[PDB]
Each structure stands twice: as structure tokens, then as C-alpha cells.
Structure 1
């Protein structure tokens, strides 16, 4: 690929510069380059990979939602809205395919620490979930199963190997709860998971880590906000 001639350490360095410059497409390309070196990522490098791709797919999801809403209101006038929505949909699917490729080809392993294993499986669930937001038909049920399966395996590892305040565990549980509510039409499963996750964190609040408590406390509030929303 285009990053094949660049040293791993220079790709990490440029990913951090791209983050500073808010060039998230470049940042994703640099981190895809680093992953393709075939060494493991540290916690700090997983953060760079996560931020870069989430920003890229974020803008695509927001674009797609704007276009989809114009299209549905227009289905209440030419092929232009459908054509342009399809164009943005195709690029979004391209980016989710790239991420799922990296996870399956390089990052997801039987070995590694719990943090890495849970993080990658959470990431697999999220990018299957993003495909599911725009999917229809035979492709779709395949996508929703793949997301649930990745999330459940992640949940199994997290409850066994991590404290209940761990920010990867909390973020995974937040995101599985969103899968249940927004994708799987299972509001009951969502509310149950979110409430269990909040209550168990608060019960074992003493388990907060000195280096991550601000992240844990933020996710705990987002589970509370979703519970208020789902009432």
C-alpha cells in the first residue's frame, strides 16, 4: 500500500501530527499503514486508530442521515437525491469494510491482553453496526448477527477479565445497549444492559483507575442519559 515504504515510528508520528491538524482521513491512512507493519498496537496507538476512523465514518454517517431524511421527505422529483445518498452510502461502506478488514487480517487475535481483545471486538461490533444503519435485505440480517456476535464475545471477555468501571468495558456496554435500541428493535435488552452496567460500576466505584477515571465517569453519565431518554 501507499504507506509500505514508511517506517512504523514515522507513520505513528504523522498520525499524531494529522490529529493536531484535524486531517482525520490522513490520520486513518497513517494508522492503516502502521497496522499493516504487522506489530501489535499499544493503548495509545489504538486511540489514534479509533479517533481517526471514527471521525471519518462520523462525517459520512452525518452526511448520509441528512441525505436520507431529504430522500424520505421527497418520497412523501428526479433521481438526484437517491443517487447522491447512494454515493455517500458506498463510501461509508468502503470505510467500514477497510476497518473490518484490518481487524480480521491484523488486530483480532486469540492471544493479547484483555484490553486489546475487548477493544478490537467492540470495534468490530461498532463497524458492523454502522453498516447495519444503511443496510437492507439478505446483506442486512448477515450484518446484524455479525455485530451482536462480536459485541457478545467482547462482553463475555470484559465481565470475566475487567473491573466494572473499566472504560473499554463501559464503552462496549454503552455501544451494545445502542445496538439493542437503535438496530435490533429490543428496547428491553437495551434498558436492562444499560441499567446493570451503570449499577455495577457504581457498586464497585472503588475500582476506578487513576489514569482513566474521567473516561469511566463520562461513560457512566452517558448510560444515565440514555436511561433518561429511554425513560
Structure 2
């Protein structure tokens, strides 16, 4: 069929063509070969599914906004369309989660990769949580927290407070508290602590990632600035 480097090339093409389902299909196939992913492959996989699920999350939100309109077979039509989108979303997140649990998290050698993949797992259980209900929601919310927590603890121990992955994890975990658990309190607490710690140890920045670190440091302040109201 196609070998790793051909798949990776296809994935790069898809990306520029803005064909993200293709890009994800290619990176899904590379992952399924069962070898630890290079930093480049890892980021291609992440970008691909982020865009794939992002499109559905976006559509879900549009329809939801609309749905909040007082008639009702139009609200019955709109509800069924939201569910159709939700179902697509769930299939995407479950594909990713399966990839993470079957290949990525278990095989990750460096603390860096493990935190990255565990944060990813937090993210995609968080995306299920945005649209879940009933008992399913409790499950996805708890699994999201578990992955974020495990990654949180490992990063505090293994990475500098200015590492972009560590900061990104903190950004998303705090977003989890705010938007999913409805804990503005611990969200701002988490964001502010992560920012402060980074500020304190600005001497831990390095050449490869100092731009990414400062950008994420800035998103943390923005979220914080946006939430404290």
C-alpha cells in the first residue's frame, strides 16, 4: 500500500490542501504501524485531528446557538441535526482515544511525549464532554480529568515550568475546570500558578521553543483576563 514516509508525505499534502480528514487518515495509519512517533509525526497527528474534530465542534456550536430560538418542527429538525453532528464528533474522538490507548501513551519513551499524549487524551475526553449527557457525561468528564491529572503530575516532576507542552497542558486543564467542571475558582488558580511559575524561571527558556512558551504564557494571561469578571 503506502509506507511510513509516503503516508507522512500524503499527510503533509493533505494539510496544505486543507483536507484534514485525509491528513488524519494518513497519520492514523502511521500510528497503527506501532512505532514511537518522531516529533514531526506526533505534531502532524495532533494538527490533523484537532482540525477534524474542530470543524465538528464549530458546527455543533453554531447549531446549538441557533437551537436556542423560540416552533417546533424546526427545533425538532435542528435537534436531530445536532445529534448527527454529535455522533460524528464521538466517532472522531473515539478514534483518537483508541490510538492513544493502543499505541501512543504506552510506548512513549520520554516524559515529554507521555505528557503530550496524556494531555491529548484529556482534550479528546473533554471534547466528548462538551456534547455528552446523562451517565455518559460523568464517564467522559472523569476520564478527562484523570488524563489531565496524570499528565499534570508528570510534567511538574519532569519538565521546566516554561516547557511549551507543560504550559499547554496547564492552559487546557484550566479550561477543563472552567468550562467542563464549572470551577472558575480552580481554573484561574491553575492558570495563574502556571504563569507565575513560568515567570519565576524565565531562565529555563531555550532556543527551540522560547517563542511557543511566551505565546502560551500569553494565552494563559488572556484566559485569565477573560475569566476574571
Q: Which residue of 2 aligns with 1:213?
A: 210
The TM-score with structure 2 as length reference comes to: 0.96
Q: 2:17 aligns with which of 21, 30, 37?
A: 21
Query: Residue 54 of structure 1 corresponds to which residue in structure 2?
Result: 50
Q: How many residues align?
A: 226
Q: Select the residue among 104, 108, 128 that pairs with 2:105.
A: 108
Equivalent residue of 2:69, what SS?
helix
Unpaired stretches in structure 1, ≥5 consecutive residues: none
State whether structure 2 residue 160 is matched by structure 1 residue 169: no
Match of 1:80 in 2: 77
Which deviations, in whole Å up to 9, do the C-alpha atoms of 1:96-133 show, x marking residues without a partner?
01000100111111651011100000000000000000
Quote the offset at 1:22 in angstroms.
1.3
The superposition leaves residues 182-217 of structure 1 with CA deviations (integer Å, 9 ceiling, x where unpaired) of 000111110111000000001001111201111111
Say whether residues 1:156 and 2:153 are aligned partners: yes
Shift >4 Å, 4+ stretches: none
1:64-111 CA distances to partner (integer Å, 9 max, x unpaired)? Answer: 001112112247x21210111111110011100100010011111165
Specify the alignment match of 2:129 in structure 1: 132
Structure 2 match to 1:6: 2
Give 1:158-197 correspondences, 5 Å limit.
158-197=155-194
Correspondence for 2:29: 33
TM value normalised by structure 1: 0.95
1:44 maps to 40
Does residue 123 (structure 1) correspond to residue 132 (structure 2)? The answer is no
Post-superposition offset of 1:171: 0.3
Q: Which structure 2 residue ranges, 5 or more long, are not aligned?
A: none
Name the CA distance, whole Å, in 2 between partners of 1:122 and 1:111. Answer: 13
Computed over aligned residues only, the root mean square deviation of the Cα atoms, in angstroms, reads 1.1
User: Could you list the per-position Cα deviations for residues 125-175 of structure 1 after superposition, in whole angstroms to 9, with x for gaps in the alignment?
Assistant: 000000000011111111101000000000011000000000000000000
CA distance in structure 2 between the partners assigned to 1:53 and 1:127 by the alignment: 10
Contact 2:36 2:108 (8 Å CA) reproduced: no
Equivalent in the alignment of 2:90: 93
Q: Are the equivalent residues in 1 in contact too, given 2:164–2:216 (CA < 8 A)?
A: yes
Question: Counterparts of 1:111 and 1:90 in 2: how far apart (Å)?
Answer: 30
